Structures are given as structure tokens and as C-alpha cells.
Amino acid sequence: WKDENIIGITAPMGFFDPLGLSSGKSDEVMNLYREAELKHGRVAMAACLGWYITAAGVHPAFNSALSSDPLEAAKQLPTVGWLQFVLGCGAIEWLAQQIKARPGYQPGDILGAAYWVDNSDEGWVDYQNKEINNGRLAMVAFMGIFVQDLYFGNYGDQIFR
Amino acid sequence: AMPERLWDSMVDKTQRSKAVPFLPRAVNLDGSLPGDVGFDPFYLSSIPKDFSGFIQPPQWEEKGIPTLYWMREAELKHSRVAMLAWFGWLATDGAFGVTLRFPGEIYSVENIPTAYEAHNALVSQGSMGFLLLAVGFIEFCTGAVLVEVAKGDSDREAGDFKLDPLSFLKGKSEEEIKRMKTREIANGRLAMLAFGGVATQTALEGGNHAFPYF
Amino acid sequence: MVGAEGPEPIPFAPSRTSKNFDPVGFAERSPEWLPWYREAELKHGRAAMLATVGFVVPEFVRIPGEQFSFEAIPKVIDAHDALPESMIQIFGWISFLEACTFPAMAGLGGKYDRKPGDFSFDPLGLYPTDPEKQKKMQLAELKNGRLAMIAIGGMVTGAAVTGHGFPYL
Amino acid sequence: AFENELGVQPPLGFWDPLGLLDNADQERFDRLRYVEIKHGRIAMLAVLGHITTSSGRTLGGNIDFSGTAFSSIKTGLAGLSDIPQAGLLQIVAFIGFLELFVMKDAKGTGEFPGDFRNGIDFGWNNFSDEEKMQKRAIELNNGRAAQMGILGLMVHEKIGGDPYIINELLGY
Amino acid sequence: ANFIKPYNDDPFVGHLATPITSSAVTRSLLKNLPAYRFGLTPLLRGLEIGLAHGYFLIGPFFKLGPLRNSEIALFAGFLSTIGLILILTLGLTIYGAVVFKEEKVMSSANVNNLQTKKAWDQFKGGFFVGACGSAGFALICLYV
């Protein structure tokens, strides 16, 4: 699986896998790992962007809150405003299970782009690396800004601002 | 990571540098230049960029300077300026016995007590602005050569100008020239760090402005 | 494990031995990281040996200066936070030595000719002539470093618990 | 090797992330099975002795001669100091005497790890071989799920007020 | 890379296969809608469709109605959803009465086919049950 799924292998650490979490595993558990990693990166990339915009000031619908750990988790109402969102992500997950039980499917290809590209166009391979490398930088960065607000009071930039 | 790494075309994994024996020698260093012990722990000589682009842009024509050559040319100019600047900074402070100052009231002790306030004081007056123009003329008349050597049209050594008015080296064996050249470099190196010392201490919270600056 | 020395007859206190000590199998899983692992194990051991004696000598000696003194600081565990002008400075010069190490790390492995840990650092001349004594020589550095890694983790954690003198008892 | 056993089922399949079974023989695994079951058999009873106390159904009367009551003792870790000392000494000596003698395979004729039946069949051959493997997996999965339940109940009662983190939402 | 090719490898056919037409999202979504799902009686096809339409046709009648500000704002509009469904069903009856042809041979091995006269009638009656029932369902859900 390591030699057929070249996406994710870059110059800083060509196939960085210390601790042997990947050593001698079936495809089905391996394909789970890649589909988990891509899902974590996508959510973290969208969380980072959604956290910076609410932090920077522009929080548009009802004008409620600037710090966005208050806005969501103490303040936004549990009964409906969180129920629906999780329900709406649940229908996307259900839809993606129908996506996964088809022939010729990649570990993380919801759009079904493998119908137009066979992964041997480097530009495709190269662009995919851009998504996943960024996704990786976003997972650590969301954890960095979440601990920063869970513990301290500062929720914005501590490095440049 | 599956291209051919850039660490191989610029690191030479066969020999080792005289300075820092645990690192391999950079490819452009030799024993050829004066004052050389193979010292380049950051592998700067090995950067494959044309640093003559700063003077003339690379889009003007085909052309390329060796990176090592441009560095030596810099290091000589950094040496020469620092040998004079350290010497000139102390001499106007009276570190050699006599407080050496230009004739005239404007450059005397009463208007400028020590060299530390000579840059800001002379900048307002204009004598500083005049020296900027005078250096500017020389730099422009001497930095065009870098272009010639980068076009392969010259066989001039780095930092070499026919400036030997007292004929120190006319007819000296290459062993004699190389040793003399090493003196320009070793004394220049010590004076680059001497000026960095003097300019730094003299600007912290304490620190005097006497001949000794500690 | 073969060639690279280190596993040798020292009985562990549970009924096992260190004749080949790799419980979770880092040798067979990712053996390309083996030169990085030895190089790590060394640098952790070298700094722990120096920091062990670095706790011994500042009990009775105290180099001349007002900034650190017994009257200035009685508890040598507090020299970290109360001399920060010397702290950044030691940190600054280590960063000059660690920075010239990068290109040795960048070709750590089969590309550069050197074995991990092996600076060309022998001014006095004490590394011996033949393998029989040389492998014994490299082995004595490993155990002394490993004994010193576990040492200062017991020394520093002891001093926060007991708050006492040098053998802590 | 050990990928088609009782304990392997959907959704996760054969779930060995850390890799303990990459260098396991028969003997290495039979120790892992025998006690993960035992960890589960504790935790499933740790759900039963626990729910009925927080629901309030307590034993009638006092506890001893000297007059401690069952209703006064709270639920969770804080109730361990309300029980008397010699009362805790009878419980620990019980569960000591349990595993030393009677939770034991002394005949050597156990069919599997976790079998304490000791050759006295209770109607286990009444089960067909598929029904045998069904009931052995239900105990295990309820064993595995109760471990994370009690680890829930111990950590949430220490952090928060009640252990029932899932009954905390939508009104206690 | 190219994300646009002729549909079904037929360059002269007048269609383009784009990510809006044939991608994994739009393939699995359209294949599970009741007008295209495998394994549905034409009654069931019409039932579901009707169940999902009568429920939201409610909204604009109850809110922006001529009697929206009265104590009988819910009644006014529910009645007018039924009148909308009667017009839509009437368009379904007439469409199938003219598009499909009656069958001579009693021969019928596919009783499941939707594009037939017999099945369209079942499909039309399922739409009317599901749309009046979903109109009544949010009559209960809004009366709160």
C-alpha cells in the first residue's frame, strides 16, 4: 500500500512513519487510515479559517460574540442550533457511504475525480500534496489555538500581533 | 521525497574540510585561495545562484559569475572597509595618544566629544552626505568589472585592482604573493570582528566612550 | 542490532536481560531510522553526563562572582530561573554548534561516510588502536551515558521532593 | 493467525493498532484473551453494583452491629471512605479468596480461556456451535464496552458532579 | 489534466460529462431519489415524491397568505395547499391519459415499469395520497 499510494510522500521526510503504525497492515485498515487523515485535515482546515474570521471581527448574522469558544459552546443553544448542524453533516456522511461502496474507489475521493485522472499526472499528484500538506499543518494549528484559549484568555495571534 | 537531492551536487562526500573535520568539504572551496582552511559550515559557497544579478539583472543577457568568486570579492571589501573604519574610529577618539581631528571648529572636541556621536552630528551638517556621494562614484566605477568577469571576458582575480603604488609585489614569487594576500585576509578578518565589537559595546546601556570601551 | 554495538550482559531487575534489548521492536520496524536513533541516544547521554557533574560541583565551589553566591542563591535547583542573563547566552552559543551540525544530519545514513555520534573530537588522543579495545571503548560511553540519563531524572525530581543536600537521603 | 477469532467482527475488523500480535504465539495470545475477558467481567458487574445505588435502591436497615447505614454512603469513589475499615477488609478478603481458589481451572480441561466451569457441564452442549460463538462474543463486547463505561464513570465523577455525562445533557 | 470529456465516449453526441453532470456526488444522489430508485412500485415512487412536496408547499400559503394575520391563518392556507395539489394531480391524470397507449395483449412481465399507462395511474394516485398527508402532517407540526 505504501508503494502504490504515493500521495503524501514529500521532501522533508519521505514517507515519515516512525513507531511502525503502518508496518505490515492489510489494505482495508490502511485505507481507513488515509480516509481518516484526509477527513481530519479537511475539518481542521475549515476550522482554522472559520476561527480566524470570527476572531478578526467579522461575525455577521445576529452580532453576538468575538471570542469564538464562548460563541459556540457555552452560548449557542444546544437544542436546535447544534442538532441540525450535526444532522446535516450526518447526511453527508451517509451520502459518502454510498460513495465508498462502488468500484474503483480511492481512500479519500468524495468528488470521484478518479473518473478523469489516474493519479499519474504529476500536476494532479502535486496539487493533492498541497491539500494534504496544508491539512497536516492545520491539524496542529487548530490544536495550538484551542489550547491557547482553553487555558489562557488570548484567542488571537500571539506570534505576530 | 523521490527526486535526486540537492545535498549531493554541493557537498562532495569524499573529502572533509580542514576546519570542522566532521563535515565534508564544500565543492567550490580548494586550497587555492589565500586564507583558506575549508571553513564553510553553512555551505554558502555552494549556492548555485548568480549574485552578479544584484548589480545587473539576469534578464539582460546570458551570464554567470561563480558564487565563490563573488564571496571573496565581498569579503575583501568587508575587510578593507573594516580595517580603515576600526582604525579611523579609534584615531579620532584619541586612542593612539593624539586626538586626531580635521582642522576647523566643526570637527573639534567641543562640537563632537567622541566618535560615537560623529555619525549623527556630521549627517545633519552634511559632511556625511558628501562622503556618500564620493564613495558612490568609486563604487560605480569599480563594480562594473564584476560584470566583465561574469561574462568570461576577464581574467582578473577577486579584489584585484592595480593598486600597488609603492610596488610591494612587482616580481614576487607566487609563494610570496599568496602569503601577502593571506595577510590582507587574516588582518581583515580580525578587523571585521574588532569593529563589530567596538560598535556594539559602545551602544549598550552602560559602556563608556573612552579608548577602552568596556 | 548487528554491527552497531550496545546490547551486552547486564541483567534487568525483572527476569529478563539486556543481551538484545528491543521490546517493541524499533530495529525491525523502520530500520532506516537506526542511524538517527543512535545519534539521538548519544546526544541525550552526553548532555546528561555533563549535567550530572553539573549538579555535583555547585554545592561546594561557586566560581567568583556576586550574581551567583550561596547568599545570593542557596538552592542550586534555582540557578535556572535566577540567572537568565547567562541562560540565553549558553543557549545562544549552543545554537552555533548545533547549527553547524545540520549538514551532518542532512546526510545521516548511508550517504555520508561517518558513523553516528562520531565527531572528529579527540584532542588528547584516547580512542584506542584496534577493534577489541575500541568496541569496548564505545560501549563504556553508552552505559555511562545511559546510567546518567536515568540519574539526573532521579536527582532533579528528588530535590523537588526532598529539598535537601546532595545525596538527598 | 489470530484474525478470524471471537473478538473480530465488523465495523473495525481485526483491530491491532499497536501491534502486540505481530510476535505472539498461542501462549502469548491465550493470556491476552483470558484477562481482557476478566477485565470485562469486572466492568460489567461494575455497571450493576453502580446503577442501582445512584437510582437509590439500597439495602434495608443498618450495615453492621454498630450502626452505619446503607443510605448514608454516596455513590462513586467518595463512598469508599464512608464504608468502615473492617467492612472494606471483608470485601477485599472476599475478592482475594475468590481468585485464589474458585475462579480457577484446576482440572486442566478448560475449552477456552475464560472457562471456569471445571468439567461440570451446565447445558453448554445444548448450544449449537454457532450459538456457542454468538454468546461468547456478546459477553466480550459487553465486556469491552463496560470497560470504557466504568472508565467514563470514574473520570467524570472526579471531574464533574455526577458521573452520568450523557444524562447531564438535556436536564439531569 | 482534463475534467471535461464527451459523455459516454461519444464526441458527436450533444452532451458533456462535467463534475456537475457525472461526478460521484451527483451519481449517488440521483440514483437514490424516488424517481430513479431501483426496487420501487410505481405507487411507492409517487408516494414518496408526494410526501416530500406537500410538506413544504404549506409554507408560503401560511406565511404570505391573504389571511396570514388572522386566527385562522393555518386553516386558510392548508386548504389552499390541497387546492394546489388538486391542480397538480389533474395535470398528472391528463398527461398519462395522452402520452401512453393501452395494451392489447394481456402480456405483462414488467408490472414494475413506470413509463406505462397502468403504472402512471398508480404513480399519480400515490402522489395525491402523499401530498395531502404531508399537508396534514405539518398542520399538526405547526399547530404547536
Ligand code: CLA
Ligand atoms: C531518548 C533516548 C534514547 C534513544 C534514542 C535510544 C536509542 C536506542 N537504544 Mg536505548 N536506552 C535509553 C535511551 C535511549 N536509547 C535509556 C535511558 C536506557 C536505559 C534504560 C536504554 C537502554 C537500552 C538498551 C539496554 C538497549 C538500547 C538500544 C537502543 C537502540 C535500538 C532501540 C531503538 O531503536 O529504540 C529507540 C527508539 C526510540 C524512539 C527511543 C525511545 C523513546 C521512547 C518512545 C520514549 C517513551 C517513554 C519512555 C518509555 C520513557 C519512560 C518515562 C516515562 C514517560 C514513563 C537505539 C539506538 C539497544 C541497542 O543498543 O541496540 C543496538 C539495546 O540493547 N537502549
Ligand code: CLA
Ligand atoms: C488523524 C491524524 C493523522 C492520521 C490518521 C495520519 C495517518 C497517516 N499518516 Mg500522518 N500526519 C499527521 C496526522 C495523521 N496522520 C500530522 C498532524 C502530521 C504532521 C507531522 C502527519 C505527517 C505525516 C507525514 C510526513 C507522513 C504521514 C503518513 C501517514 C500515513 C502512514 C503513516 C501511518 O500509518 O500513521 C497512522 C496514524 C495514526 C494511526 C494516527 C496517529 C496516532 C496519534 C494519535 C499518536 C499520537 C498523536 C500525537 C503524538 C499527539 C501529540 C501532538 C499534538 C497533536 C497533541 C497514515 C495514513 C505518511 C504517508 O503519507 O504515506 C503515504 C507520511 O509520509 N503523516
Ligand code: CLA
Ligand atoms: C468546522 C467548521 C465550522 C464550524 C463548526 C462553524 C460554526 C459556526 N460559525 Mg462559522 N465559518 C466557517 C467554519 C465553521 N463555522 C468557515 C470556514 C467560514 C468562512 C466562510 C465561517 C464563517 C463564519 C462567520 C462570519 C460566522 C460564522 C458563524 C458560525 C456560527 C453559526 C453558523 C454559521 O452561520 O456559519 C456560517 C458559515 C458557514 C455555514 C460555512 C461553513 C461551512 C463550510 C465548510 C461550507 C461547506 C458546506 C458543504 C461542504 C457544501 C454543501 C453545500 C454547498 C455545496 C452549497 C457557528 C458557531 C457566526 C458566528 O457564530 O460568529 C461568532 C458568524 O458570524 N461562521
Ligand code: CLA
Ligand atoms: C572606513 C573608513 C572611514 C570612514 C567612513 C570615516 C568617516 C569619518 N571620519 Mg574618518 N578616518 C579614517 C577612516 C574613516 N573615517 C581613517 C582610516 C583615518 C585616519 C588615517 C581617519 C581620520 C579622521 C579624522 C582625523 C577625522 C575623521 C572624521 C570623520 C567623519 C567626517 C569625515 C567626512 O565627512 O569626510 C571628509 C573627508 C573626506 C571627504 C576625505 C575623502 C575620502 C575619500 C573620498 C574616500 C575614498 C578613498 C578611500 C581611501 C578608498 C580608496 C579607493 C579604494 C578602491 C581603494 C566621518 C565620520 C572627522 C571627524 O568628525 O572626527 C570626529 C575628523 O576630524 N576621520
Ligand code: CLA
Ligand atoms: C463491582 C461491583 C460493585 C462494587 C465495588 C460496589 C460497591 C458498593 N455498593 Mg454496590 N452493587 C453492585 C456492584 C458493585 N457495588 C451490584 C452488582 C449491585 C446489585 C446486586 C449493587 C447493589 C448495591 C446495593 C443495593 C447497595 C450497594 C452498596 C454499595 C456500597 C457498599 C458495599 C456493599 O454493601 O455492597 C453491596 C453489594 C451487593 C448488593 C451485590 C454485590 C454483587 C457482586 C458484585 C457479585 C460479584 C461476586 C459474585 C459472587 C460473582 C458470582 C459468580 C458466580 C458464578 C459464582 C459500595 C459503594 C450499598 C450502599 O451503601 O449503596 C451506596 C447498598 O445498599 N450496592
Ligand SMILES: CC(=O)O[C@H]1CC(C)(C)C(=C=C/C(C)=C/C=C/C(C)=C/C=C/C=C(C)/C=C/C=C(\C)C(=O)C[C@@]23O[C@]2(C)C[C@@H](O)CC3(C)C)[C@](C)(O)C1
Ligand atoms: C441484629 C444483627 O446482628 O443484624 C445486623 C448485622 C450487621 C453485621 C451489623 C449487618 C450488616 C451488614 C452486612 C452484613 C453487610 C454486608 C455487606 C456485603 C456482603 C457486601 C458485599 C460486597 C460484595 C462485593 C463488593 C463484590 C464485589 C465483586 C467483585 C469486585 C468482582 O468483580 C468479583 C469478580 O469475581 C468475579 C465475578 C470474577 C473474577 O474472575 C474476577 C473478580 C474476582 C474480580 C446488618 C445487616 O445491619 C444486620
Ligand SMILES: CC(=O)O[C@H]1CC(C)(C)C(=C=C/C(C)=C/C=C/C(C)=C/C=C/C=C(C)/C=C/C=C(\C)C(=O)C[C@@]23O[C@]2(C)C[C@@H](O)CC3(C)C)[C@](C)(O)C1
Ligand atoms: C442464578 C445465580 O445465582 O447466579 C447467576 C445469575 C445470572 C444472572 C444467570 C448470571 C449472569 C449473567 C449476568 C449477570 C450478566 C450481566 C451482564 C452485564 C451486567 C452486562 C453489562 C454491560 C454494560 C455495559 C456494556 C455498559 C456500557 C455503558 C456505557 C459504555 C455507558 O455509556 C455508560 C454511560 O454511563 C455514561 C458514562 C454516561 C451516561 O450518559 C450514559 C450511560 C449511562 C449509558 C450469572 C453470572 O451466571 C450468575
Ligand code: KC1
Ligand atoms: C536545516 C537546514 C536544512 C535546510 C535549509 C534544507 C533545505 C532543503 N532541503 Mg533538506 N534536509 C535537512 C536539513 C535541511 N534541508 C535534514 C536534516 C534532512 C533529513 C530529514 C533534509 C532532508 C531532505 C530531502 C530528503 C530533500 C531535501 C531537499 C532540500 C531543498 C531544496 C529544495 C528545492 O529547491 O527544490 C532545500 C532548500 C530536497 C532536494 O534536494 O530535492 C528536492 C529533498 O529531497 N532535504
Ligand SMILES: CC1=C(/C=C/C(C)=C/C=C/C(C)=C/C=C/C=C(C)/C=C/C=C(C)/C=C/C2=C(C)CCCC2(C)C)C(C)(C)CCC1
Ligand atoms: C436548503 C439546502 C438544502 C436542501 C434541503 C432540502 C431541499 C430539504 C427538504 C426537506 C423536505 C422537503 C422535507 C420533507 C419532509 C416530509 C415529511 C416529514 C413528511 C411527513 C409525512 C408523514 C409522516 C405522513 C403523513 C400521513 C400520510 C401520508 C397518510 C395520512 C396520515 C399521515 C398524516 C400521518 C441542501 C441540503 C441542498 C443544502 C443546504 C441548503
